[PDB]
Amino acid sequence: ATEACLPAGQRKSGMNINFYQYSLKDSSTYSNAAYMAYGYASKTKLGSVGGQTDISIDYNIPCVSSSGTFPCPQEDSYGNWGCKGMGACSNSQGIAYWSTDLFGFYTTPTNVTLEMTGYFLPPQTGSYTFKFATVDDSAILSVGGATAFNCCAQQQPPITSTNFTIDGIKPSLPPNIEGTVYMYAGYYYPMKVVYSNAVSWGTLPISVTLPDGTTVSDDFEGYVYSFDDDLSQSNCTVPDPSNYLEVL
Ligand code: NA
């Protein structure tokens, strides 16, 4: 069974996002499981935002044209280089860019690592299939109190588990990388996404298919929550929700 939790403190809507330094055009650091599970936090912490319910990433670099500067959808880049409907671009694909596109935090989405944490609250008991439609550049998803982070300890340093629910670590990988978790209604499941980009475009389309077959994509409002740490809440961890002994 996947470990879940019952935090007793004030629930907040959305995930916390911590941002950490990642070097432009470093294509090797994020290829390692240890880095993606926890090593990212040994680099400089850039900052954080909270309360985020729209969690998909779709970062497009600028195209500087005489008609102005506009983000170029990845699929519209061509040549050496232009953007369809904009002509040739005067700016490089290969430098850092500053934007608030990631969760409103002003940083360099071209080169950054971020950690999303929160608790997923299943409305229905059954099999949930999480998916990343594509990954630019490297990402993991972990679900469970022994795999994502410890119950009632959302804000602590990362745990060392490499038992990822979705392993999207840059070796490129196929599209539509998926991992399934059997979940019991009403229990709060620790959830961690770590995402990294080294250059240019960044993409992580996150979705989950519910037991009833419906798909929730990008906007996880009503499903994801945060709690401030309470390391003193003795009963918080539920190692096997299918054998929890009290009334939920
Ligand atoms: Na990229």
Side-chain angles (χ1 to χ4, degrees), residues 1-171 173-248:
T2 300
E3 176 167 287
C5 334
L6 292 167
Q10 178 54 240
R11 194 177 71 169
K12 311 176 155 74
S13 180
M15 299 181 85
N16 183 263
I17 321 295
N18 283 337
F19 296 82
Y20 300 85
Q21 184 279 321
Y22 191 92
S23 298
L24 185 76
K25 288 175 283 194
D26 176 357
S27 69
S28 69
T29 298
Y30 62 23
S31 72
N32 300 292
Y35 174 80
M36 291 303 285
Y38 61 92
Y40 57 90
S42 66
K43 308 313 178 75
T44 301
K45 190 183 186 184
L46 307 174
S48 70
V49 299
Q52 300 296 308
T53 54
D54 300 321
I55 64 171
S56 289
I57 294 169
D58 182 27
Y59 170 67
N60 294 325
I61 60 160
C63 177
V64 180
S65 74
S66 284
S67 85
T69 300
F70 302 91
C72 183
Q74 188 172 6
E75 62 272 19
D76 289 353
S77 65
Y78 68 91
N80 308 277
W81 67 295
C83 190
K84 296 296 177 67
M86 309 190 185
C89 306
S90 67
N91 59 306
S92 182
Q93 304 186 0
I95 63 173
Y97 295 99
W98 284 257
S99 170
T100 55
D101 179 72
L102 309 173
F103 308 104
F105 180 72
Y106 187 68
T107 192
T108 52
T110 48
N111 58 296
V112 67
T113 298
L114 61 86
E115 174 207 72
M116 319 187 194
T117 54
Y119 296 83
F120 185 87
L121 177 62
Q124 316 180 307
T125 292
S127 184
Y128 286 74
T129 306
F130 294 84
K131 187 170 65 77
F132 292 159
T134 193
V135 181
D136 300 304
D137 295 352
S138 193
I140 60 85
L141 169 69
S142 289
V143 181
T147 75
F149 60 84
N150 295 326
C151 293
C152 281
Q154 187 185 342
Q155 303 171 288
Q156 291 293 303
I159 64 166
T160 58
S161 183
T162 56
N163 187 15
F164 311 119
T165 302
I166 301 174
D167 182 340
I169 297 181
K170 184 193 171 63
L173 295 169
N176 301 134
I177 312 152
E178 295 190 330
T180 299
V181 188
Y182 197 93
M183 298 173 134
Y184 299 86
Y187 298 84
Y188 284 94
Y189 284 84
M191 179 181 174
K192 177 171 66 179
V193 173
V194 176
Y195 165 79
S196 190
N197 196 19
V199 74
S200 68
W201 289 270
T203 321
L204 192 67
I206 306 176
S207 63
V208 65
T209 300
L210 311 181
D212 69 7
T214 61
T215 299
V216 175
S217 301
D218 316 317
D219 179 7
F220 281 64
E221 183 164 32
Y223 297 93
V224 294
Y225 296 94
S226 293
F227 292 91
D228 292 355
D229 286 351
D230 185 4
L231 274 40
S232 84
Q233 190 195 319
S234 299
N235 71 357
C236 187
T237 306
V238 180
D240 180 2
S242 79
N243 193 47
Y244 176 64
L245 303 187
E246 301 287 314
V247 175
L248 188 46

